[PDB]
Amino acid sequence: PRKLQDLGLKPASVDPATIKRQRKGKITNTHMTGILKDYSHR
C-alpha cells in the first residue's frame, strides 16, 4: 500500500497485518434466596 502510494498508483487494499496494528461474599437474606435476580445492568 505505502509503496504504491509512493509510486503514485493509489491502492485498492487496506493495509495488511504486517503493518502496525492493534469475588464472592456472604448473604444475610437466606430465607428467600434464589429469588433475588442478578442486576449487573440497569
Partner: protein, 353 residues
C-alpha cells in the same frame, strides 16, 4: 454533579477521602471532601497531612457546606476557621437540632437567606404531595402490664414490639404493595427491623450488613417488582443512595429528633410519579397508644407542622376483621412474643505457638 451539570473538567475536580487523596495541579480548581477530613484530630496519614496543609495554605473564595445542620458539632464547627474561605453557603434540607446550637450557624455561616415554601413547591409539581399520617396502635393488655414496671431502654424495647403495630405494618405493606407503591419502612432498632423482616419475609438493611448486599438488595427494590418493601435502619436516615418510594412506614424512632423525620420524608419527596395528576405520596408514623410514642412523635411532628404538613390521625384500619394473614392474632403468640422480648435482655521457635 459538578462533572454533569457544570463545565468543570475532571482535572479541575479533586477528591479528599480515605481511598482518594490526589488533587488538581492547576492554580485554581475544585475539591470535594468529607467533614472529618478536616476536623479529625486523630493520628492521620502523611498524605492527608500534606493535603490539609495544602487546603490551609490555599486561599478559597467559596465553600459549599452541604448538610449544614451538623456543622455546629464540636469538630465540625472548626472547619470554617481552619479553611479560610471568603463565601460560605450552608445547604441543607433539615435546619433543626435537638440542642440549641442550630442558632449558632449565624456566627458559623451567616444570616438565613432563603426559606422554600413546602406547600408551594408541592402544589406546582416540584416536590411530592405527601400524606402525613399517624397510626394509633392500642397497647395490648399483657404488654402494657409488663410495661408499667420497666426501665426506659427496656420500655422502648417493649413498646416497639407490640403486636398491634405488627398487624398495622403488615396491613399497610399488604395494601400499598397492591397499589404499586415502593415502600421504605424505617425502624432504628436493629432488633426491631430484623424481627419485622423475619416476620414478613422482607429484606432488611441495618448497619453491619455488607455493602454489596446493600447494593444488590437496593437494585432489587429498585427494579425487581417482586420486592417492594425494604426495612431500613438509622443508616437510611442519613445520606445513602436509595430508590424512589411513594409510601413510608415509621415503626420505631430515635426519640423526638426533629432532623430525622424530614430526612426520612425527603426520600419520599423525590418521587417520580409527581407529574401524574391525582398522585399522593404516603407517610406513616406508627405509634403505640398510651405509651411514650405520642410524646416522642409530637416532638417529631412539631417541626413538620411548623413547616405546614398535616398528620391525619388514624385509629382504625379497614381490614383487620378480614385480613388474610394475621400476625400475633392468638393470645398465645402474643404472650410468646412478650416473653421473647423479656428474654431479649527467634526464627525456629516461632513454630511453637
Amino acid at each position: 454533579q459538578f462533572l454533569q451539570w457544570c463545565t468543570l473538567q475532571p482535572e479541575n475536580c479533586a477528591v479528599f477521602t480515605s481511598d482518594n487523596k490526589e488533587m488538581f495541579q492547576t492554580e485554581s480548581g475544585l475539591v470535594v471532601s468529607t467533614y472529618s477530613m478536616v476536623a479529625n484530630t486523630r493520628n492521620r496519614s502523611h498524605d492527608s497531612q500534606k493535603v490539609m496543609d495544602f487546603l490551609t495554605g490555599r486561599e478559597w473564595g467559596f465553600i459549599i457546606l452541604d448538610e449544614v445542620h451538623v456543622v455546629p458539632a464540636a469538630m465540625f464547627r472548626r472547619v470554617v476557621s481552619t479553611i479560610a474561605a471568603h463565601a460560605k453557603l450552608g445547604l441543607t434540607a433539615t435546619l433543626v437540632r435537638e440542642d440549641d446550637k442550630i442558632g449558632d450557624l449565624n456566627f458559623l455561616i451567616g444570616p438565613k437567606l432563603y426559606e422554600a415554601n413546602w406547600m408551594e413547591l408541592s402544589q406546582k409539581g416540584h416536590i411530592a404531595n405527601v400524606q402525613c399520617a399517624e397510626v394509633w396502635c392500642p397497647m395490648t393488655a399483657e404488654f402494657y402490664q409488663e410495661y408499667l414496671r420497666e426501665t426506659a431502654r427496656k420500655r422502648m424495647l417493649l413498646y416497639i414490639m407490640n403486636p398491634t403495630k405488627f398487624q398495622a405494618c403488615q396491613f399497610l405493606i399488604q395494601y400499598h404493595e397492591r397499589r404499586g407503591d415502593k415502600i421504605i419502612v424505617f425502624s432504628d432498632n436493629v432488633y426491631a427491623l430484623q424481627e419485622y423482616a423475619l416476620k414478613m419475609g422482607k429484606p432488611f438493611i441495618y448497619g453491619s450488613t455488607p455493602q454489596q448486599e446493600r447494593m444488590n438488595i437496593l437494585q432489587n427494590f429498585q427494579y425487581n417488582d417482586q420486592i417492594n418493601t425494604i426495612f431500613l435502619s438509622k443508616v437510611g436516615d442519613t445520606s445513602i443512595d436509595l430508590p424512589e418510594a411513594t409510601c413510608l412506614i415509621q415503626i420505631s424512632s430515635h426519640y423526638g429528633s426533629r432532623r430525622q423525620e424530614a430526612q426520612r420524608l425527603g426520600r419520599i419527596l423525590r418521587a417520580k410519579r409527581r407529574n401524574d395528576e391525582g398522585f399522593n405520596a404516603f407517610f406513616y408514623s406508627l405509634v403505640s397508644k398510651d405509651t411514650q410514642e405520642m410524646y416522642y412523635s409530637t416532638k417529631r411532628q412539631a417541626f413538620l407542622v411548623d413547616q405546614g404538613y398535616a398528620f391525619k390521625v388514624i385509629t382504625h384500619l379497614h381490614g383487620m376483621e378480614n385480613i388474610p394473614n394475621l400476625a400475633y392474632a392468638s393470645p398465645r403468640e402474643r404472650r410468646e412474643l412478650l416473653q421473647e422480648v423479656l428474654l431479649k435482655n527467634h526464627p525456629l521457635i516461632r513454630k511453637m505457638y
